[PDB]
Amino acid sequence: MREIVHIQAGQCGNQIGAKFWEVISDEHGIDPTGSYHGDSDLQLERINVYYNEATGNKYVPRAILVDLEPGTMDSVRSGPFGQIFRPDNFVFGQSGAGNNWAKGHYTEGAELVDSVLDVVRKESESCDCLQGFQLTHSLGGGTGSGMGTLLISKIREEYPDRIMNTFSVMPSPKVSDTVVEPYNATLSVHQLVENTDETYCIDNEALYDICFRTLKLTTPTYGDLNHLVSATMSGVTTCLRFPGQLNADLRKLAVNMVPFPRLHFFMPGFAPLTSRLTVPELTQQMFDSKNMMAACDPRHGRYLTVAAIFRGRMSMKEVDEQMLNVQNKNSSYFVEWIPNNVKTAVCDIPPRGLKMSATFIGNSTAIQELFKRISEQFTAMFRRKAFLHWYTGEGMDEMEFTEAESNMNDLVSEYQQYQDATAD
């Protein structure tokens, strides 16, 4: 089989991680004890991608739960699917992050890192054919951002020809008051652009704006934001989890989606947006700015590559027609120099609550709007050196902030370069 190893780090990582496992367990017919009581053989055909098969015909998530605070991992065990996890895959610290990247990456997280690697090793070593790794984390905190990216670097050393995939939640002042997060994000992006193959950009800015404006929620909660994150996560992993022809494993996806190694930051989308349609409507909503999980307008750049997944019982002829339709009518927004760069998959099994849905994965040059926003907030407080001593204290030079700032702006220039390029 082609197995993926899941890792969830920090508060955000473990939250969205837990909900990911709730949702896909529902889809695959797995209850919290880990027994199959589903109605279809298509649920089990590729169960080994995410689940280990234990004794007594039971299924255990190949998941590794990590945090420097021991508190957040108590709440995971207490959770509805908490009992299903492997008890010795819980690796917890003492101090906590303090929303300090350096603590996560160089000091406190460094002390804990070998303990996580021991568990990763034991999962990896008993895989028939390991695809690679999937990490859920935020970039604004200290553990998920700093230790999560250390984890990434350390797993590459030992599995250098395996695919490294992250779900990386971006900070927004609209969601968290912590003034330091622009540093944590910039230092994390510095890592991700070098050491991941594919990164889904989950932008809290976008998740808040969808909840406030479109869903008409006056005081959106982390649970409201994560309803969107989990639907996105179910959608983008559908091709990996069910039998299919297109993007069926992590490397094939990467080869379809990443034309240049550094440009591996995707902009997911979803239709219909809900809180707790026809193919032409799903197809129009998918490419419209409102439905993007990154606060970027795709009309402000060009798509390098696109994956579109349609879920439900619908006409495959109608999807083909609408997907041609949307490309003709939006031709300028697709780079002319990568022919046939939009791929389409149709999975008959719909997600829970919806009779048909659509998931979008775009590699757009418009993603630069996200990185420029972070870069403005970073450079607001880095010119005046606000709160540098938090990081200098842990041993970091000031030069590493300059290098990381510069690499993130190099990335911006690069997106712009391929946005402006023609076939001539």
Binding site: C129, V255, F260, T305, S315, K317, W337, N340, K343
Partner: protein
């Protein structure tokens, strides 16, 4: 004797293989267990069907076939499917991890780990042959295994078998069913690497087969199963010369003599008729003249291109079923009286014809009407070059920016291999231009 060994590489090669063998077994009266009641020589023989099937002492007729894929899923369905007893387990070869739509993985990284094993199993089939003719290699252009592994294998077969014949059935990519943006790269790379090692290659445009299924069989959104059942019929028509004997049968090697004027110009255009649904075939005989004229309609071609804007260098017709010389001769004389077809000035305006009396078969629960008589035309037209030009343009669009090139470089390839592969293709397009210019 004159044994042929079939090699099916990657998902496309393998799935088309299944459809071909299933169809062969139906045509010869061979059961899914390999038993063939009509064959009175148990244990062996030199009947025409023995070019493609060996025999065991227990009366089992075993395909002279290897199925190779770098990943077990597709071949696992052959191992457990309707025809699992037909094949010895050693003919079905799989690795663990596929080439991820990357020629470089198929040729070098993953491919090298299984290549000696594949040659081993091929050698075992070869050593059961009294007079091995050659090989038929089925593969996609687009896939990493189909492109990269097939190339490596063709290179290795030239070394281990000298100038023993190698024929390809190559699946040319179409956007309606493609699964990879880099398929143009894989196509150019494999065509460059394979060109010196192949004697004759039949390209099958998935878009062409897709359109025939939509237009002629009224299939709304054709699947691989739809495409493969039609592809099977065309392959069967071509190999029918080898698998059946008959007084008017012309061997595939005789057609090749006419089809290949220069070593590099070895890509014949196939056209098949009639493709018709059961509902339309009811109360409708298509005569010899009718199916023959249908060979000159571009809508029936296996590759999208226009031979009315090119020139012919050869034209072969492979009839099967209730077809007699008088009707063929009259039908073809009309065609040349009518013109519509121009030969290059260095090629005589002949038509090489074969007839096998055994009529076409269809697989149960399929889309094709069972008809009394079918024809496959194999022509050598300058027009086939259109297919190279369409792929070469897509290649250039991406390669000018080096898009996706790092995936190939990361597995060991150099940019030199891309530009070298592309120049060879530019040379091939020029060759097809040059053969069609009039003589001085």
């Amino acid at each position: 004797m004159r044994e042929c060994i079939s090699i099916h590489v990657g998902q496309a090669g393998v799935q088309i293989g299944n459809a071909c063998w299933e169809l062969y077994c139906l045509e010869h009266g061979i059961q899914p267990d390999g038993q063939m009641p009509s064959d009175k020589t148990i244990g062996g023989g030199d009947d025409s069907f023995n070019t493609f099937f060996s025999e065991t002492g227990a009366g089992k007729h075993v395909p002279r076939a290897v199925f190779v894929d770098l990943e077990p899923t597709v071949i696992d369905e052959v191992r457990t499917g309707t025809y699992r007893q037909l094949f010895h387990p050693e003919q079905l070869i799989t690795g663990k991890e596929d080439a991820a739509n990357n020629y470089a993985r198929g040729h070098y990284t993953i491919g090298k780990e299984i290549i000696d094993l594949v040659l081993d199993r091929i050698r075992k089939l070869a050593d059961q042959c009294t007079g091995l003719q050659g090989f038929l290699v089925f593969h996609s252009f687009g896939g990493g295994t189909g492109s990269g592994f097939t190339s490596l294998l063709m290179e290795r077969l030239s070394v281990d078998y000298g100038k023993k014949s190698k024929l390809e059935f190559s699946i040319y990519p179409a956007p309606q069913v493609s699964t990879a943006v880099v398929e143009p790269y894989n196509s150019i790379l494999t065509t460059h690497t394979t060109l010196e090692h192949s004697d004759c290659a039949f390209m099958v445009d998935n878009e062409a087969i897709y359109d025939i299924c939509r237009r002629n069989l009224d299939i709304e959104r054709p699947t691989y199963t739809n495409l493969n059942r039609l592809i099977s019929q065309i392959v069967s028509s071509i190999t029918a010369s080898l698998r059946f004997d008959g007084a008017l049968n012309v061997d595939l090697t005789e057609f090749q003599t006419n089809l290949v004027p220069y070593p590099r110009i070895h890509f014949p255009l196939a056209t098949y008729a009639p493709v018709i649904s059961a509902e339309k075939a009811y109360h409708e005989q298509l005569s010899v003249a009718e199916i023959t004229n249908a060979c000159f309609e571009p809508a029936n071609q296996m590759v999208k291109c226009d031979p009315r804007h090119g020139k012919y260098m050869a034209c072969c017709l492979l009839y099967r079923g209730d077809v007699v010389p008088k009707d063929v001769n009259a039908a073809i004389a009309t065609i040349k009286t009518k013109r519509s077809i121009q030969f290059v000035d260095w090629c005589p305006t002949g038509f090489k014809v074969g007839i096998n009396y055994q009529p076409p078969t269809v697989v149960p629960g399929g889309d094709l009407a069972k008809v009394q008589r079918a024809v496959c035309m194999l022509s050598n037209t300058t027009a086939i070059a259109e297919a190279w030009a369409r792929l070469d343009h897509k290649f250039d669009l991406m390669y000018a920016k080096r898009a996706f090139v790092h995936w190939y470089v990361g597995e060991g390839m150099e940019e030199g291999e891309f530009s070298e592969a592309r120049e060879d293709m530019a040379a091939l397009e020029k060759d097809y231009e040059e053969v069609g210019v009039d003589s001085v």
